[PDB]
Write an enzyme that holds these catalytic residues in place. Structure first.
Site, PDB file in Angstrom:
ATOM      1  N   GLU A 211      -3.141   3.660   5.624  1.00  0.00           N
ATOM      2  CA  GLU A 211      -2.503   3.879   4.330  1.00  0.00           C
ATOM      3  C   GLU A 211      -3.366   3.373   3.201  1.00  0.00           C
ATOM      4  OE1 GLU A 211       1.270   1.884   4.143  1.00  0.00           O
ATOM      5  OE2 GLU A 211       1.585   2.356   2.049  1.00  0.00           O
ATOM      6  N   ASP A 213      -2.870   2.759  -0.678  1.00  0.00           N
ATOM      7  CA  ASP A 213      -1.894   2.766  -1.810  1.00  0.00           C
ATOM      8  C   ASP A 213      -2.666   2.749  -3.101  1.00  0.00           C
ATOM      9  OD1 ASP A 213       0.394   2.531  -0.086  1.00  0.00           O
ATOM     10  OD2 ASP A 213      -0.257   0.504   0.262  1.00  0.00           O
ATOM     11  N   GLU A 216       1.303   1.069  -6.691  1.00  0.00           N
ATOM     12  CA  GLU A 216       2.668   0.590  -6.420  1.00  0.00           C
ATOM     13  C   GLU A 216       3.036  -0.176  -7.644  1.00  0.00           C
ATOM     14  OE1 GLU A 216       1.664  -0.613  -2.118  1.00  0.00           O
ATOM     15  OE2 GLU A 216       3.867  -0.219  -2.545  1.00  0.00           O
ATOM     16  N   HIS A 227      -4.901  -0.272   3.514  1.00  0.00           N
ATOM     17  CA  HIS A 227      -4.389  -0.781   4.821  1.00  0.00           C
ATOM     18  C   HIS A 227      -5.037  -0.039   5.920  1.00  0.00           C
ATOM     19  CE1 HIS A 227      -0.429  -2.519   3.214  1.00  0.00           C
ATOM     20  NE2 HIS A 227      -0.656  -1.576   2.267  1.00  0.00           N
TER      21      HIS A 227
END
Ligand SMILES: [Mg+2]
Ligand SMILES: [Mg+2]
Ligand SMILES: [Mg+2]
Length: 431
Positions: A211, A213, A216, A227
């Site tokens: 992942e 991101d 956020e 991640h």
């Protein structure tokens, strides 16, 4: 899962830009937000936050008996509070119908009716505009990428006949157990309902994958985080491999914490927020560059634009403790995790190299709006753990009492996030 036939499936159109050309695409609702019902009639298979134990006495029988249904043109707005126009997409928080209430949503960008769009972010710059001004403490309007299968799992899992057309196959670096369908099967074995989320529960399987991101955030704090996992793409897990919250957090196949770059956590409190250098009270442009050396990722840089101004990323501000990095790099991740006393699971799972190989294999774009029934979003915007007073605890300006889902759903139900002008292209120079 199989597809039901009560409601037609319509993907909501959305335009974006790819290497200078307009692309007329669409978004699809994640299967977890859909109605799951019997193949025989309208009886719910998934009812409140538990599965029907007659329809679903075990996962195999449940998968045989149960179908996910469509989201038609009118359902986007009336049930989920989602609208689009041109390159603009708006997600809503609480949308009340006559017979049910929806909380948030998660959607994926489609290439066509049956396949998610696959982004190869290496040596590219990905940008978009976001208005986070209507997101209070405790909410998260997120834009991110995950290593889902392009067809949502239809080719690999014979009992998934619905596929990306019905938003199947979500996974992320949390190895979530709240997914109702994983590896084409109902996740109904060992199902426990949530004690505080009336719509959610957890099953024996989790859905793991890398992942990235990009964003956020709410109006008060923002982060971007890489991640990496030690497994190849979409990977069902059970048991210790899921690395569940608690004692097993660092024992599974994915890095749950990630290598995060959160400006406020890094000692730059006035950089982003109401009246910040980057002002959350109005639309802003988020630019992210995936810089390579020898064809491998070595740095994830961030630039903002707002009101025609170019705003370089705020650098780590711990004078005498940590160097003033201003991007995600291997050295940043090592040094900041040493400083914060965080276990470096990012390196354990493969670090920048493992992350580079994830990106090389292609990822699906996700946009979502949600509240947090595990940790009240305090990890993003407040202090976490709540009573901790050591370096890395302070995350943002919000109270440690903020973000309880019961509170935010009651008090800020009209919250929304708008994403727009999604763009991918060659890395540009900024000054
Ligand atoms: Mg059986
Ligand atoms: Mg494509
Ligand atoms: Mg079993």
């Amino acid at each position: 899962q199989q597809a039901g036939t009560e409601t037609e499936e319509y993907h909501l159109p959305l335009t974006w830009e790819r290497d200078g050309s307009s692309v007329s695409a669409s978004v699809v609702i994640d299967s977890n937000w859909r109605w799951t019902h019997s193949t025989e009639d309208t009886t719910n298979c998934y009812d409140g936050n538990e599965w029907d134990s007659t329809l679903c006495p075990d996962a195999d029988t449940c998968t045989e008996n149960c179908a996910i249904d469509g989201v038609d043109q009118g359902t986007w707005g009336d049930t989920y509070g989602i609208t689009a126009s041109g390159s603009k997409l708006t997600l809503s928080f609480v949308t009340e119908g006559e017979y049910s209430t929806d909380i948030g949503s998660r959607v994926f960008l489609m290439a066509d009716d049956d396949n998610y769009e696959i982004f190869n972010l290496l040596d590219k710059e990905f940008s978009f505009d976001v208005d986070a001004s209507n997101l209070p403490c405790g909410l998260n309007g997120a834009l991110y990428f995950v290593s889902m299968d392009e067809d949502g799992g239809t080719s690999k899992y014979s009992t998934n006949t619905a596929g990306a057309k019905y938003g199947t196959g979500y996974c992320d670096a949390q190895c979530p157990h709240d997914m109702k369908f994983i590896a084409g099967k109902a996740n109904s074995d060992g199902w426990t309902p949530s004690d505080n989320d009336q719509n959610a529960g957890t099953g024996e399987m989790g859905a793991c994958c890398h992942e990235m991101d990009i964003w956020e955030a709410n109006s008060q704090a923002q982060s971007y985080t890489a991640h990496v996992c030690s497994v190849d793409g979409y990977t069902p897990c059970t048991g210790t491999d899921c690395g569940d919250n608690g004692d097993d957090r660092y024992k599974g196949v994915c890095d749950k914490d990630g290598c995060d770059y959160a400006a406020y956590r890094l000692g730059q409190h006035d950089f982003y927020g109401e009246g910040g250098t980057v002002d959350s009270g109005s639309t802003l442009t988020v630019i992210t560059q995936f810089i390579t050396g020898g064809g491998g990722l070595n740095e994830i840089r961030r630039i903002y634009q707002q009101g025609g101004q170019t705003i370089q990323n705020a650098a780590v501000n711990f004078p005498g403790d940590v160097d003033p990095y201003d991007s995600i790099t291997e050295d940043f991740c090592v040094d900041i995790k040493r400083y914060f006393g965080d276990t470096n699971d990012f390196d354990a799972k493969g670090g920048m190299s493992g992350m580079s190989n994830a990106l090389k294999k292609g990822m699906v774009l996700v946009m979502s709006l949600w509240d947090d029934h595990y940790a009240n979003m305090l990890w993003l915007d407040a202090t976490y753990p709540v009573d901790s007073t050591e370096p890395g605890a302070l995350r943002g300006p919000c109270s440690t009492d903020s973000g309880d889902p019961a509170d935010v759903e009651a008090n800020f139900p009209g919250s929304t996030v708008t994403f727009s002008n999604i763009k991918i292209g060659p890395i540009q120079s900024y000054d």
